[PDB]
């Protein structure tokens, strides 16, 4: 065959002129690797194999390093007529084969707007091209392949000898390496082909197989050759509506080989040698070079309009983590960066959350954060959308084969599936990422793509789609990261289900492959880390593996100390290991003959035949990681030694990644790199991180550059940075370190300066989050008063106040004349007021207060929810607001204060000053509320003046600010029957919180204070899905069932309703109103499936809140005094059956009214207030009385029935023991006559009046004696029953027991002391009763009382 030679300094490649084929590679040393030794001239186009003849190919040697081929590819019958241009180039030990041009003689190209290109060239390949091959006739001929596996128990690798029996045909792999006759090679291709995988729960580029292995007979030997899998060129796709499109290539077809000798110099030639060479030709994920610097990964979360984490708070948190890690690199994923938060506004990528501070604050956070080595990225979704999103349209909607919506998940709103193919082919998604690019410029590091590969956008989401998705992202300068462990093998640098080891179990983690991890460990956080309960790959991997925790609200995670502890336990050593590239990996226990890995490398002269990995950097530094034993039953299987240039830098067992068992690992890791591009730092900046799991004393050999030092400087790392400095002597290049358990230390050669941190930049105050330690109360905040101010809490630090104290700070950078809202988180445990005040000079611009906090925090993503223990195992943190105009003098000051001298605490956190246009609060002259209006158009955050209640416990609450996007958010679009927005752009929305039987949301006194005794007109616009499913709740103090006044609301589905009521302020100033979920089932109107959710039959929308104080009729002192008499005359006699707290509330109220009435110099205003407070007290006591009368009537009913359980349930729920009806019959009377001994004894123990009588003068003893209940009569006399008690006739329980003729009951009561002299109105004794009836048996016991 006629050939030509391409030359480099490393090899000579003999190539055929009749086809782009290699005959052989001859290296400088004379070693040879074969190409395609046979006459194979096949080209596949659209699945049709065409064999080329001599006249179908033209050749041209361009230079000594390049040749060009022109391929005439025609099949008239199969509609193929193409001209393919192939380039072969050589450099060093690499050969590249590129398709540089594709000409189609059967088309004019792709029609405008990605229209269908008829006879388009969709696929292209060179079947059995064998660019590199090995033969069974060669010394140590072998194949090594890798396929995708997310399963910890199933490796993705194959390792086998190439023999005469080896028979393969287009066997597809992610990676493929052939070795033989002292040379090795891997084949790289940019093919987007999807094929064979070991294990993956999703698509989304998990199945990308780019190499094809095929055997052929090469004379008397079997030859195994490598070819590229097919490439896509102009691919024709169909969307959910049946519309077809043709989309151009992501890139032109490209492939390469890199010929290796014994690269790691270990005396053998295998895939590892090929893998070292392969790194020079392989694709590298965009920005994969920064991956080793990303030590601190975490999520900063925002959800449901709450603004739990505004961008400038996230920046303070970056500075806290920077101090605690001594400036290690960070990667913060902003989950809910856009619109109203997480799983809101998808897919509006360019809509940055206005309530977080918008694009302005996001850019400030990214720009400033980068100075601390912190990278930022956003969570996006390209599979699900909500009606509120501006991108929402009929074209975007994914539809099923029947024409209906492809529904997603319902939570805040109903998610609808995005038509993935439409989104790509129309240029829609690329334009939405462009919207984001305009907002962030070049400040943002990465994109985090959620759910991609789970088939929500289409049944495909293949490697071709994922390749195009990753390109749109990389094109904007963004690093690619995604959700699923197996997803996007080609371009992703991080998988959430790989780095967060807790999710999905052992079958759904990161990439379980020795080949993939050997090649790319340093480029991704997509592997298997320690999580021993999964076993296999997850049991102490030598390379570690990212273990991700959070503290900023993601899944309620708000534990900072655990976050930091975990960074040092797993992530510091994982990241240190990623600064080196794998060069050798022997004795892998996961690979056996049974799982298809008989030829896997097994050296008994390395680490006793146990697992070992060697890694190297471009500076010749060597890292060696060794496993103690390859037996999982041995204690040494989890033992790992790490050496750096032959010196031990880490030893022992890590604390289990699943949090199940603490370890003993200690390390002294040299951190030689900067937190930016990872370049080597200078000598004065070189440092060592020290960690000791169990704590104690360890001795280490310092690195070579430290061997002549006399001493080192050791600093303990905290949330304040470098503390407790120690000078440690160096003897013979060694150091002894004493360490507390699980405590980070940093070692320097000399004195090291503290990292400079200016807290709360752009926040208008210094240290708004109280992160500056105790010192913050000295030069940032000024403290005054007899009381005390402390920075308290070992997690999220807060300001704690006790006694009479004020904490002040000057406000900076305010725009003169502009409107601002200032809010602060407040938890008040004191009865004394806690306040927030803005002053200019001395003048008060705005002020607000809270008494004892009455509402617990149920916001899961928030830093101080009721699961975080602010004090006493609870948290009452709620945002307290002030609205003011920035003064013209530019002098403004905030003051946080506690007024009373009591010892109870008040907590404050997160002082937020934000530009805000809300102006719906009007006051009276005395500073009390005149009116409050809200259309929710200018809310700084949350559902203010309401606060979320406990209907779902601590949750990502299904309550938020709904957004207008007509016609989609309106009633009538699809199966939707309710409007999301009543008027304007925003309303308050509740999604499906039906049949809870509890409070959903409520006002609190710090948001809307209802003055004691004052009357208010409350009105709002609403939309409710069904009749009586939701109600208006009115209460005083902390919500409690039974104490609440409920008004059921009627159905207002698609048509806005009006709600109006009057509210009278409770005596303690703690009155409130809200929305309550009843027990009543919604009317789903015959809807099925998602239509029950989307319809709105179970939802509640509120808007246009209006609260107005109603003027009261003026009262005199006489009127108020008389009202005191009336109230006392009604309730003074009702102390017995009334709670000890209810009697206290009543007494406190009477005291309050008397103080107003009797003050020297009291006015009409005081007399009106005193009278009104008593009127409010009356209605409160009366409502409580009807609820007690309800319980009493049910207790008298259960006394008759005889059920102890329902008698005890009612008594425990507050039932009156001595409760009598219209005829004066108590439950002790009823239980005694029926004879329920278990109830009689329960009632007597509870304090029931044993002497109690009805309108007939009958006591429970009279009733029990006539009925003849011996056991009941016994216990009554033992509890103090009146033995000689009489009725309206004069019958003692002796007379009645004789009338009924009870032989055993008469004798029992006589023994105790029942009178025999007793006579009724007729003057009849027991002598007359015994002689009247036909039985003389009674006359025998009476003649044994007195003998006649
Ligand atoms: Mn080797
Ligand atoms: Mn804080
Ligand atoms: Mn509105
Ligand atoms: Mn919404």
Residue numbers in the entry: 340 to 1687
Sentences from the paper on this structure:
Here, we show how peptide and protein targets can be reproducibly crystallised as “guests” in a host crystal under predefined conditions, and we explain the advantages and current limitations of the host lattice-display method. In order to apply this approach to biological macromolecules, we engineered a host lattice comprising auxiliary- and target-binding domains; Fig. 1B outlines the design strategy. The auxiliary domain defines the robust host lattice by providing the majority of crystal contacts, and thus also the crystallisation conditions. It serves as a scaffold for rigidly positioning the target-binding domain to immobilise guest molecules at well-defined positions.
In contrast to L1, the L2 linker orients the DARPin paratope towards the central solvent channel of the EngBF lattice, allowing for larger targets to bind, but with fewer possible crystal contacts. For creating a very rigid L2 fusion, a disulfide bridge between Val1406 → Cys and Thr1488 → Cys was used to shift the three-helix bundle and the connected DARPin closer to a symmetry-related EngBF domain. A second intramolecular disulfide bridge (Glu1476 → Cys to Glu1555 → Cys) connects the loop of the EngBF three-helix bundle with the loop between the DARPin N-cap and its first internal repeat to reduce bending motions. Three additional disulfides between the DARPin domain and a symmetry-related EngBF domain crosslink the DARPin in the crystal (Cys1064*-Cys1685, Cys1090*-Cys1656, Cys1118*-Cys1617). EngBF-L2-DARPin_3G124 was co-crystallised with sfGFP, again under the established conditions and the yellow crystal colour suggested that sfGFP was absorbed in the EngBF-L2-DARPin_3G124 lattice. The EngBF-L2-DARPin_3G124 crystals diffracted to 2.3 Å resolution in the presence of sfGFP and the ED map confirms that the DARPin_3G124 domain is locked in the desired orientation with the paratope pointing towards the solvent-filled channel of the EngBF host lattice. This orientation provides sufficient space for larger targets up to 40 kDa, such as sfGFP. Superposition of the DARPin_3G124nc:sfGFP structure (PDB-ID 5MA626) on EngBF-L2-DARPin_3G124 reveals that the difference map agrees very well with the expected orientation of sfGFP. After refinement, sfGFP possesses an elevated B-factor of 214 Å2 and the 2mFobs – DFmodel σA-weighted map shows discontinuous density for the sfGFP main chain and no clear side chain density (data not shown).
